[PDB]
């Protein structure tokens, strides 16, 4: 251990001595974080390999036996930094990341066990916070000898030495110190390497300042260490202890959230607002794939920003942002489109169901068959809260909680009174309906309504409803057909978009950060007269659709339709980053739903 103490000196050396010209980065970082009460430091393994190779060669060999030692010195480092003596100072956390070298999950077996592995995968579900020991002490049940154990990481049962026997010790719970542990359940990336099979989930565990760092269902990178423990031959459960974890780009986001700030954003986000093309250049962000369909193309944008959400007392609150329908003949690009749309969302879930992929479209509470006691299992809508709703096959959605969609879209909630739990839980999720209409183009010579299940009311529940009609028509094709062979090889259209990147167009991983950005600032609002304009526009929309109904035609319009078009205003306005909205500003939102009014006229 004095060998380990020489290693201790080696790391104290490592910190005090190291230089990037000229400040000692970790050293600054310490006194920086001690007032953060971070009590942790993120160290490049490359500044380490650059400092002394030796210590890594032995670190990479049995890091488990060293990582705590590495901390016992830097926790001492704070002692020689934080304050001078001649409290209480918590035992440090360390989080180390490195560029390293990526390894795929399916190939992880034996071998590399008990070493470092950088890798990504994606988390499925977060385990509840579980607190674990840091310090504990004990008096003897018989001789009353006072023991003090420092419980360190990374099982180990309590030592019995002062009948006395066999092991007469019970924890002094009053004086003990503690830490949280996460128990990540995380899954391999969707792309590799499923081969034919199902995606694996390998279990890992956070602690301290690592906890709650990562959302359920977001792409992430963990480094950690591959290890095993029994957990009822020898057949012990595979797992990875976690150091250090870093979000895949960004992800940051959560919570409240982040910028941070990198000032060039405000300017670059304001210049966007000074670009008259910005609304439309967002439209040109959405489909490098899809040439044309500019209408619905303008329709996607306004959703993601979030629309008006105003909470006015009493508890009455109106939703945002809205709903959209991609229903139309196959060839619409709407699934390809949607597979753009979800990748655009900062946080969302792609549902072609039924519900996705295996998800109860609404959270279905299911008993833990072990230790009984129903617990809510989460849901696609639930996890997608404050994010996009993706729906295919909406012709086929679960009929019982189809209504929970009929509800959650509107009341921004789902009430579960089932079993024990009565909690009404938030889905503020904004739906985009991509289903294929009954019989394709055959509902066009028929009543276009009742197309969606057996009721027209679903349309009212939705907002921006759009029927995409592609006739086989000339030259609108020959140009997109021309667009095609370019799109494929050699991405002759995907190069042509990179000079529009330099000339005009957005990068769209940017578009995430844009829509994340302007959704966290307070809700935009129209001046009075555009609203009264919504009044004389709609009095004629409604007038028109009673007069249209002079033929006794069954149908379509509501008073949530006018309001629907309202939210589109604050959407398109939230583009502007402006607390107000101009008359014409609102007006192209009007022309934007105006096609849906003729969808009512067809």
């Amino acid at each position: 251990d004095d060998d380990n103490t020489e290693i201790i000196k080696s790391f104290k050396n490592f910190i005090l001595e190291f230089r990037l010209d000229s400040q000692f980065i970790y050293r600054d970082q310490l006194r920086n974080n001690i007032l953060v009460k971070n009590y942790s430091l993120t160290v490049n393994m490359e500044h380490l390999i650059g400092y002394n190779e030796d210590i890594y060669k032995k670190l990479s060999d049995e890091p488990s036996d060293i990582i705590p030692l590495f901390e016992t010195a830097i926790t001492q480092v704070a002692k020689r930094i934080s304050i001078l003596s001649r409290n209480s100072l918590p035992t440090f956390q360390l989080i180390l990341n490195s560029n390293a070298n990526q390894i795929p999950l399916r190939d992880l077996d034996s071998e590399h066990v008990s070493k470092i592995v950088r890798l990504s995968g994606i988390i499925i579900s977060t385990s509840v916070l579980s607190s674990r020991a840091t310090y504990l002490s004990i008096m003897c049940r018989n001789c009353r000898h006072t023991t003090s154990i420092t419980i360190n990481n990374f099982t180990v049962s309590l030592p019995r030495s002062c009948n006395c026997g066999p092991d007469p010790y019970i924890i002094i719970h009053e004086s003990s110190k503690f830490i949280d542990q996460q128990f990540l359940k995380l899954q391999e990336i969707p792309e590799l390497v499923p081969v034919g099979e199902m995606p694996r989930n390998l279990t890992m565990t956070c602690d301290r300042y690592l906890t709650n760092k990562v959302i359920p269902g977001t792409r992430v990178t963990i480094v950690g260490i591959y290890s095993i423990y029994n957990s009822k031959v020898a057949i012990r459960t595979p797992y990875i202890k976690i150091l250090g974890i870093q979000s895949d780009v960004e992800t940051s986001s959560i919570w409240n959230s982040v910028t941070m700030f990198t000032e060039e954003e405000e300017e670059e986000f304001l210049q966007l607002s000074r670009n008259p093309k910005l609304y439309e250049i967002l439209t040109n962000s959405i489909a490098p794939s899809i040439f044309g369909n500019e209408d619905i193309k303008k329709a996607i944008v306004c959703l993601l920003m979030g629309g008006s959400k105003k909470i006015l007392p009493d508890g009455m609150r109106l939703r945002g942002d809205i709903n959209v329908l991609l229903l139309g003949d196959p060839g619409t690009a709407k699934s390809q489109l949607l597979k753009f749309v979800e990748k655009v969302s900062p946080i969302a879930v792609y549902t072609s169901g039924k519900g996705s992929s295996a998800a109860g479209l609404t959270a279905s509470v299911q008993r833990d068959p072990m230790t009984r006691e129903f617990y809510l299992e989460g849901g696609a809508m639930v996890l997608a809260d404050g994010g996009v709703v993706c729906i295919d096959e909406f012709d086929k959605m679960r009929d019982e909680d189809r209504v929970a969609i009929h509800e959650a879209m509107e009341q921004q909630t789902i009430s579960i009174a089932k079993a024990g739990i009565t909690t009404v839980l938030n889905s503020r999720t904004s739906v985009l309906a991509a289903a294929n209409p009954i019989y394709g183009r055959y509902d066009d010579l028929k009543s276009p309504g009742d197309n969606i299940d057996f009721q027209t009311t679903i349309l009212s529940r939705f907002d921006m409803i759009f029927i995409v009609k592609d006739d086989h028509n000339e030259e609108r094709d020959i140009s997109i057909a021309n667009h095609v062979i370019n799109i494929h090889t050699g991405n002759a259209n995907a190069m042509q978009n990179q000079q529009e990147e330099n000339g005009s167009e957005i990068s769209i991983e940017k578009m995430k950060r844009y829509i994340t950005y302007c959704r966290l600032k307070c809700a935009p609002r129209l001046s009075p007269q555009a609203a009264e304009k919504l009044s004389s526009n709609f009095v004629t929309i409604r007038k028109q659709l009673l007069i249209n109904e002079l033929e006794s035609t069954e149908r379509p319009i509501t008073i949530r339709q006018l309001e629907a078009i309202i939210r589109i205003t604050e959407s398109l306005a939230k583009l502007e980053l402006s607390p107000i909205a101009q008359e014409r500003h609102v007006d192209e939102a009007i022309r934007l739903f105006q096609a849906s009014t003729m969808d009512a006229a067809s």
Partner: protein, 553 residues
């Protein structure tokens, strides 16, 4: 034709005044030999506290554009990499301006043969050849002094016959293969050495300057190791560590490899994008792929460990790496990889061989950013030149690493492309010379860069011919994307397999001139480098028929 101390102490006399100066460098151009040399030179001027404008010219014609554009009270002048062939006194004209003329001009280069106007008729220059090529070169001695000033009937054809003897003598000079000789950096190093200064930087800049061309021959570069290693022995940073130290922290010799991006890239891909591995081991082949995996089957190295980052390979694999190599690589003919050359150290930031540090410099050249479009474009190249200027500067190591990864980007384009041309089999043996052409593919704009096709066809001549017996043949490549068919096209020459009997002297410098002296429709000498010209597809195919005959070589 003067020792450096004289011309330098003389440029001092015209050097300090305010407002400046008046003298200025012309960085010429995109070829790296100037860059280090300019920088040390820059520092020199900065050490003597002397104001100088800094001009990164590109085009050959663009030189005329600039000299004619703004030079006014300029009392003296610097130029690089140019005029080793064509005279500016003709190109600029000039004309006398006020013996002890109002303006001095300096010009540097290793390219040969020098112009006839260069050593004699001293007006603009101040010929810099010293002390490289004396030579003699007693042929220019008779090219003037026999030529100048040049019974009466019979001595007429006699004078004209002796003059025809000087004409047939001097005709052979100036008609001859154009070649590089010595990195100007070592000239300015022995210059700085004559003045007495040697900085470990300046020797490392010498390294990068000398090393700049190491893909091309040596040839003196083989004996430059002594001209450098001895200086490496002239630098004794310390008797001993003194660990690390965090600062100085200076270079030493070590096991370098022709293998590519070693330090910062996976050992696998290090063998994989590497040039020397390519032809010898057949990299476009899957045969040589598996066969390569046989090498690790003799190296005791996992395919995983080949995918490994160089930083994390076991200390064991590091210490034994070379010895392992000695036990195996000698099997497939790979014994010539290992080289004892030079490696800079920033220590904590890592260590980098010169050979390696070269490549990323060459990265910032093509990437890292109606006839006006290509001038704006060349202008963009010259723009990204400067990012490489600061990429020489250690102060920001970070910006360099950009181009470092970018090398993996470049080669990933290149290696893939060359193979893509190999299974297509685009080679035409012709008779006199092997030649190919590229009509289209991915990233042809990246092939606009003279150097991209230079590295490309370098890699591809190493590839097409190891040899690859018999009778190595000179090469030409072409490509087009935009501009209506500028068809960037370059002349190329075979590299021996490390065992160079002769200098070999590219004849296309003359030959392309014979075509520009020919019908020369659409042909553009706008390029500085005779090896390469712009050509229109319409006339390039007959440019190719006219390239067939007359075969000059």
């Amino acid at each position: 034709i003067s020792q450096f101390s004289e011309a330098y102490n003389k440029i001092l006399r015209n050097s300090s005044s305010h407002s400046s100066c008046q003298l200025v460098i012309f960085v010429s151009c995109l070829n790296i030999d100037a860059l280090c040399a300019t920088k040390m030179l820059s520092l020199l001027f900065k050490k003597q506290l002397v104001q100088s404008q800094i001009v990164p010219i590109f085009g050959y014609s663009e030189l005329r554009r600039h000299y004619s554009q703004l030079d006014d009270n300029i009392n003296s002048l610097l130029l690089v990499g140019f005029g080793g062939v064509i005279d500016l006194e003709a190109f600029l004209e000039i004309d006398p301006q006020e013996q002890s003329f109002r303006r001095d001009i300096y010009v540097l280069d290793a390219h040969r043969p020098w112009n006839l106007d260069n050593i004699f008729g001293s007006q603009i220059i101040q010929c810099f050849d010293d002390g490289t090529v004396d030579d003699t070169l007693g042929e220019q001695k008779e090219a003037y002094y026999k030529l100048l000033e040049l019974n009466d009937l019979s001595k007429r054809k006699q004078r004209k016959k002796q003059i025809h003897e000087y004409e047939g003598v001097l005709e052979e000079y100036y008609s001859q293969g154009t070649t590089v000789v010595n990195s100007i950096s070592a000239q300015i190093y022995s210059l700085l050495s004559a003045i007495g200064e040697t900085n470990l930087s300046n020797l490392w800049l010498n390294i990068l300057g000398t090393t700049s061309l190491d893909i091309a021959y040596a040839q003196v570069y083989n004996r430059l190791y002594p001209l450098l290693q001895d200086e490496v022995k002239r630098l004794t940073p310390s008797s001993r560590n003194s660990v690390k130290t965090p600062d100085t922290l200076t270079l030493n010799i070590q096991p370098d490899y022709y293998l590519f991006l070693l330090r910062h890239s996976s050992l696998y891909d290090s063998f994989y994008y590497s040039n020397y591995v390519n032809a010898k081991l057949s990299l476009w082949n899957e045969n040589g792929k598996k066969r390569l995996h046989k090498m690790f089957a003799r190296m005791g190295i996992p395919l995983s460990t080949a995918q490994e980052t160089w930083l994390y390979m076991d200390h064991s694999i590091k210490r034994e790496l070379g010895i392992i190599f000695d036990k195996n690589l000698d099997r497939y003919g790979l014994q010539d990889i290992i080289r004892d050359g030079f490696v800079r150290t920033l220590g904590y930031r890592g260590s980098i061989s010169a050979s390696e540090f070269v490549e990323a410099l060459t990265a910032l050249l093509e990437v890292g950013n109606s006839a006006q479009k290509l001038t704006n474009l060349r202008k963009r190249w010259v723009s990204n030149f400067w990012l490489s200027w600061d990429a020489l500067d250690d102060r920001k190591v970070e910006l360099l690493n950009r181009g470092i990864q970018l090398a993996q980007d470049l080669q990933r384009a290149i290696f893939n492309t060359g193979v893509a041309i190999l299974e297509k089999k685009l080679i035409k043996h012709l008779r006199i010379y092997r030649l190919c052409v590229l009509q289209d593919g991915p990233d042809l704009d990246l092939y606009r860069n003279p150097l991209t096709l230079l590295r490309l066809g370098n890699w591809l001549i190493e590839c097409c011919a190891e040899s690859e017996d018999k009778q190595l043949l000179p090469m030409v490549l072409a490509s087009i994307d935009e501009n209506t068919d500028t068809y960037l096209v370059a002349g190329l020459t075979p590299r021996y397999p490390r065992g160079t009997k002769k200098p070999i002297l590219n004849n296309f410098s003359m030959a392309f001139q014979q075509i520009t002296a020919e019908t020369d429709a659409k042909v553009r000498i706008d390029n500085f480098e005779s090896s390469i010209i712009e050509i229109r597809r319409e006339d390039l195919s007959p440019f190719l028929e006219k390239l067939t005959l007359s075969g000059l070589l």
